[PDB]
Ligand binder design. Structure first.
Ligand SMILES: C[C@H]1CC[C@@H]2C(C(=O)O)=C[C@H]3CC(C)(C)C[C@]213
Ligand SMILES: O=C(O)CCC(=O)C(=O)O
Ligand SMILES: [Fe+3]
Ligand SMILES: [Mg+2]
Ligand SMILES: [Mg+2]
Length: 275
């Protein structure tokens, strides 16, 4: 793996505004352990599971960690957005309290959330990983304001093998980087764009650590990050997660902030190619 390090546990920095902001400024992310209500997170995992039983031919008697699906692509993603009640989760007072502590002011949560339910493909000779993400910055496609932050949460635990999101430590300090067409990552049967290896720095150490439901990983608009594929074997786990963006309540609310995933993903996926 190109991963060379773990996320730093930033939870004890929450009590110190100056130290929290200092870490975030240098590194471009915060990793917070067990700050969300784990029981609330479980209910969202359960919602996703029931969607997968209805739409992905998942075992109706499997536990969350026993669950699998034959194919991410066979699942109607639009219909999954009716099952997973993410807005109710993000806007729960317990969740909002955490967001407000991070920003130090009232927040607005994007009306778009991406939901991810990725089965293990350990052993597959022709794995389907084209639905993952290349190295990119969320600020490449979200704007015009660049003061939102991405909030990424596991719905069930991740392992180093089941994957998640890898962060290039401190890669958010030189603005937007070039994103170029990459045939190996696709949405709606067309390539998307990612940051090429020539815009990657060896100094921006790649980080990924296992996370538990209740944890949050959040990062700057210019943080360069990529998906880690699910090659889990023991245990063989689904990688179940969701990501939204959050910004100060006073900041401009752009297209991405105001438009649900079902009404924007297709158009945005085409739109980025003209950027
Ligand atoms: C920039 C690329 C990779 C990351 C984003 C992404 C994702 O799944 O996070 C899929 C592509 C389509 C998009 C318009 C939402 C922008 C994406
Ligand atoms: O979880 C992934 O595979 C990618 C996540 C991502 O790009 C994001 O949260 O902005
Ligand atoms: Fe992203
Ligand atoms: Mg059985
Ligand atoms: Mg800058």
């Amino acid at each position: 793996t190109n991963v060379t390090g773990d996320y730093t546990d930033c939870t004890p920095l929450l009590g110190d505004r100056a130290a929290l902001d200092s870490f975030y400024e240098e590194h471009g992310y915060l990793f917070l352990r067990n700050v969300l209500d784990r029981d609330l997170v479980k209910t969202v995992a359960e919602q996703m599971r029931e969607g997968l039983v209805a739409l992905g031919a998942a075992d109706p008697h499997a536990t969350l960690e026993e669950l699998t699906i034959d194919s991410f692509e066979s699942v109607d993603e639009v219909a999954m957005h009716d099952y997973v009640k993410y807005d109710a989760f993000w806007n729960n007072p317990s969740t909002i309290k955490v967001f407000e502590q991070v920003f130090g002011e009232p927040v607005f949560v994007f009306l778009s959330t991406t939901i991810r339910y990725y089965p293990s493909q350990a052993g597959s000779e022709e794995p389907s990983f084209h639905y993952l993400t290349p190295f990119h910055q969320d600020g490449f496609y979200i704007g015009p304001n660049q003061d939102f932050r991405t909030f990424w949460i596991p719905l069930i635990r991740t392992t180093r093998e089941s994957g998640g999101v890898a962060l290039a430590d401190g890669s958010h300090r030189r603005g937007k980087r070039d994103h170029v067409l990459n045939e190996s990552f696709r949405r709606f049967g067309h390539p998307v764009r990612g940051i090429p290896p020539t815009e990657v720095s060896e100094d921006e150490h790649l980080l990924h650590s296992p996370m538990e439901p209740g944890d949050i990983l959040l990062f700057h608009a210019h943080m360069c990050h990529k998906s880690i594929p699910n090659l889990s074997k023991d245990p063989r786990l689904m990688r179940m997660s969701m990501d939204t963006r959050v910004q100060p309540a006073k900041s401009h609310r752009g297209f991405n902030a105001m438009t649900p995933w079902t009404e924007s993903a297709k158009d945005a996926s085409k739109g980025i190619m003209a950027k």
